[model samples]
Target: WESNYFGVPLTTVVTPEKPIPIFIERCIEYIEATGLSTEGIYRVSGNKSEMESLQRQFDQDHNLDLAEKDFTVNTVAGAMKSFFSELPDPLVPYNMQIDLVEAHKINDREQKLHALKEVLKKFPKENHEVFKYVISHLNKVSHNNKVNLMTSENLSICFWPTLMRPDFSTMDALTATRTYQTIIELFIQQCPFFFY
Candidate 1:
């Protein structure tokens, strides 16, 4: 199969009805079905070897089933993060970096939410679609924090890098991480409020 999923942009893989790639959908579905109660969920790492195998299978045969593979919740979640971090371009584009950073910097909460919502409008359809599902899924995970203990804050820190990066050509490293993490946490907690 020449149409491998990883390291490729969503434009090459998305469709109208199912905008997120099937590979991502598969992992999301599997995790939703089995991982909500997992103590650490996405906060911890899975077996690196298992994650590599997952990457290999997705790259070599994109349609393979995670259900068929005896994998843990962490392995599936880890594979999801691995696939995201390996994208040819980030889910959030380079141009939005500054706006997003600025959105989080707003001091007033209502205005901050408004600014963040305005920035959400700027996402390309493909990027928005992927972001929508992932954040909503994380919201579900956050709702299960009683057991998973992976609240929106922890989820944000864990996923900030994989979901977005600053314009390294014009940014600071020590604080860049917190800036991005803040936005992700907001999105995870207020995902529904951000969009329809």
Candidate 2:
């Protein structure tokens, strides 16, 4: 089957019965193992040819059949984001969407943090662990501004939609963006134990 998310074409030749969790786990592994630092292919490497080689190898290993010319660090990252964004039920879980929205609505920072943590607890262990790991990894990478030049502001911009559930509706783009940003910031600041 062929699918496209945000203009990135995703072709899957063999679909697993439960592909969402598998994809999420794979992305978590990728972020933990290879994407922790901005040192390779994407930011500090400055070697497009090497990244292209890696992309070719990755396509071959996964039977992705992506064109070599279309492969880039951004494309790989987009693929991961698309995997989460396109899922029928987001990794965050549809039932928890309203809770997250409400949690973000809390005016008090400490209370908001407690509410968000409670929402996190509602997720299955696997989902919670992987989601938390990815957020923590993102936080670590964002701190390495010299390498990737990704600050919390820009990182939030990139991840706000990626981490949010599609079924989760808000009043408008402004409200949604604000909630997303708040969610990410809270995760980064108050969820340090997630990495451990």
Candidate 3:
């Protein structure tokens, strides 16, 4: 589990060295101490409403300030986990590629230039012509375009990785644009679900 502590002076991120297994007795005791229903079970159900409610309850019990506005983020996380478990790696290649691309995009110019140089340092031994082309193009673009290109390239790579997934594979550029426009369509489909 990951935590985001916004509005706090200092936030602590917990990245465990190894997985920690909690015993049933310890879980039960924690639940009892927190006045939560021990019998309630958590399942990776796609029913948004049910999942949202459970997430809200979980947040309250743990003193986490996450509210309904954070529902999409939670849903995305759950969807990724579920999709990864059931689908092959090729199905989500684009997503992974996009992430790496974005990381480079967000770094400062010096960092970006340094990264490009570092990659170029390896030259033909470890790098490909395509990568060299990217660095050359990056050199040509203005600062803004440089960032944009980095972000776009990252997103493209991400999309490429997930091309095997029906969501990515079936989408044409126009259809993909429309899909983003309808990102909140689920809310329109169900008016009562007041998330954000």
Candidate 4:
């Protein structure tokens, strides 16, 4: 079978020599070129053979010396998740994580929105724009609730941790999780139009 069965160009590859930011930029471009983002659903079954095939092609094409442990999945879906996970900075600013937790505690919805907005502004423009694009697509996915069934709650759970990196010295696992959940919930509630 052709290694390019997935239609990913052999030229699009990642190597350890490249800085992560540049790699991320290239990954985003590669993903867009593949049209994987437009798909309504992304699922990974983690088939070992399939993953190995994917890993082999990816390593060969990209000049990466990655082992199975270096990455989780070999599919486009896996790559997308890996892009977010491997970032030196979480999509959401680390400083804002606690503020997000506090934002959720506010009784007033408007006040909560305001607080979250302030935190959103703290993100670097590149990260902010990427997240806006991602969340906007997620909103569309959530709209097809019959097929996707991805509610704001579901999105919150799925993306919260992806957005934030907790300070272990100051925040415990439970606290970090709660903060992450709150941040997602706030973004979904206040920025429903973001998905559009």
Judging by TM-score against the true structure, name the best candidate.
1
Encode model 2's per-residue lDDT on 31-92: one tens digit a residue: 54555554432222234454445434544465333343344445455555655565555557
Better of 1 and 2 by lDDT: 1
Measured against the true structure, the TM-scores of the candidates, in listed sequence, are: 0.92, 0.64, 0.21, 0.61
What's the lDDT for residue 32 in model 1?
96
lDDT per residue (tens digit) for residues 72-168 in model 1: 8899999898878878888888777668877878899989999999989998988999999999999999998988999999999889888885566
Worst 10 residues of 2 by lDDT: 5-14
By lDDT: ranked, best first: 1, 2, 4, 3
**Per-residue lDDT over 14-114 for candidate 3, one digit per residue giving the tens place of the 0 to 100 score:** 11331111111222233223312211111223456644454445534544333433443334333322322333333224343333333345357556544
| RMSD in Å for all candidates | 2.0, 6.5, 20.0, 8.6
Selected candidate, larger lDDT, 1 vs 4? 1
- Against the hidden true structure, what lDDT does model 4 obtain? 0.54
Q: After superposition, which runs of candidate 4 have C-alpha atoms over 4 Å from their true positions? A: 1-74, 167-169, 193-196
Give the Cα error of residue 115 in candidate 2, in Å. 1.5
- Write one digit per residue (lDDT tens) for candidate 4, span 141-171: 5565565555666667766766665667776
Order the candidates by TM-score, highest first.
1, 2, 4, 3
> Given candidate 2, what's the lDDT at residue 181?
78
